[PDB]
Design a protein around this ligand. Structure first.
Ligand SMILES: COc1cc([C@@H]2Nc3ccc(C(=N)N)cc3[C@H]3c4ccccc4C[C@H]32)c(-c2ccc(C(=O)O)cc2)cc1O
Ligand SMILES: [Ca+2]
Lengths: 254, 55
């Protein structure tokens, strides 16, 4: 996260840290006691699926304070329409091997209904994005969880406000832009998979997933986020399904 | 009705035939008698931050 602040411990309780072989891989979002939403692209290069770990209640990577809960990731479910190495449909649904225990420091973010998200949440201007990603483009990653308030744009507006770079991925209906074009504030690659969370009448909801962008906090460019509202039905159906052998599952989308 | 200001609902909104509207809530919440408000039914409802709620 570039240009944000430390998330006070416990105020980002749905934030997930994903590790492979002990090394930080990506962020994610807890949406109930066994399911985590992350980005599909986080898993493009994984070979040993048995070493994939989700940590809840994490805050400071340098210390263990006892609020951390680690779980093996039993299944990673990705839309059939996602193509590794590209940008579209950048979403994954992770089933934990054992539920986390909800506490003051571990709480799910609400996955909204589609209609509520499209008709109401999509028009809340500002939302929070968070993670242990890079503090600067080409800089070091954060030891404490960081959070940033970013404004959402209509996609027409994004394309008009953004500099043209050529070869740039299209911004599809399964994405949206949020952030700032002055080079000051953005999420970054190490925040991939983490929450874009939106407040409405007292409660926070999952609306986006940190997905991609041109560098980090690059002048003329905004962060691009997976538009979670397109996937509500897909996610809900999967969360009602029985587990299948093998960690990776490609599931039809729609 | 639901398209305008979320039908007045705190969380979810369903349209019905005519000027009928039903508000609903996420699991872990129940709807109050005003027909719009949602109140937690569990200790750790989604989307609420305990250390701030307890202040
Ligand atoms: C959408 O798919 C993908 C998106 C990303 C990765 N994810 C993200 C995420 C957020 C932002 C943002 N500015 N809000 C930017 C990027 C992009 C970015 C910023 C800086 C360098 C390279 C990239 C590619 C890309 C990667 C990626 C992630 C991490 C690393 C690394 O650690 O070196 C390299 C590439 C791979 C994908 O497949
Ligand atoms: Ca720690």
């Amino acid at each position: 996260i570039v240009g944000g602040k430390v998330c006070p411990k416990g105020e980002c309780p749905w934030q997930v840290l994903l590790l492979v072989n002990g090394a930080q891989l990506c962020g994610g979002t807890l949406i109930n006691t066994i399911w985590v939403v992350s980005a599909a692209h986080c898993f493009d290069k994984i070979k040993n699926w048995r070493n994939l770990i989700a940590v809840l209640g994490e805050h400071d990577l340098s210390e263990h304070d006892g609020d951390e809960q680690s779980r093996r990731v039993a299944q990673v479910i990705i839309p059939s329409t996602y193509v590794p190495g590209t940008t579209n449909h950048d979403i994954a649904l992770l089933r934990l091997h054992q539920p986390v225990v909800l506490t003051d420091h571990v709480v799910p973010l609400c996955l909204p209904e589609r209609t509520f998200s499209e008709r109401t949440l999509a028009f809340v201007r500002f939302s929070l994005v968070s993670g242990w990603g890079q503090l600067l483009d080409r800089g070091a990653t954060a030891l404490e969880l960081m959070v940033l308030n970013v404004p959402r744009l209509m996609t027409q507006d994004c394309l008009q406000q953004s500099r043209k770079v050529g070869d740039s991925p299209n911004i599809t209906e399964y994405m949206f832009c949020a952030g700032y074009s002055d080079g000051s504030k953005d999420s970054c690659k190490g925040d991939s998979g983490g929450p874009h969370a939106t407040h409405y009448r007292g409660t926070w909801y999952l609306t986006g997933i940190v997905s991609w962008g041109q560098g980090c906090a690059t002048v003329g460019h905004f962060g691009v986020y997976t538009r979670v509202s397109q996937y509500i039905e897909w996610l809900q159906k999967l969360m009602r399904s029985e587990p299948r052998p093998g960690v990776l599952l490609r599931a039809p989308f729609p | 009705i639901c398209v305008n200001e979320n039908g007045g609902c705190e969380q979810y909104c369903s349209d019905h035939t005519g000027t009928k509207r039903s508000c609903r809530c996420h699991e872990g919440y129940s709807l109050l008698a005003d027909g719009v408000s949602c109140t937690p039914t569990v200790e750790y409802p989604c989307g609420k931050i305990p250390i701030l709620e307890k202040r």
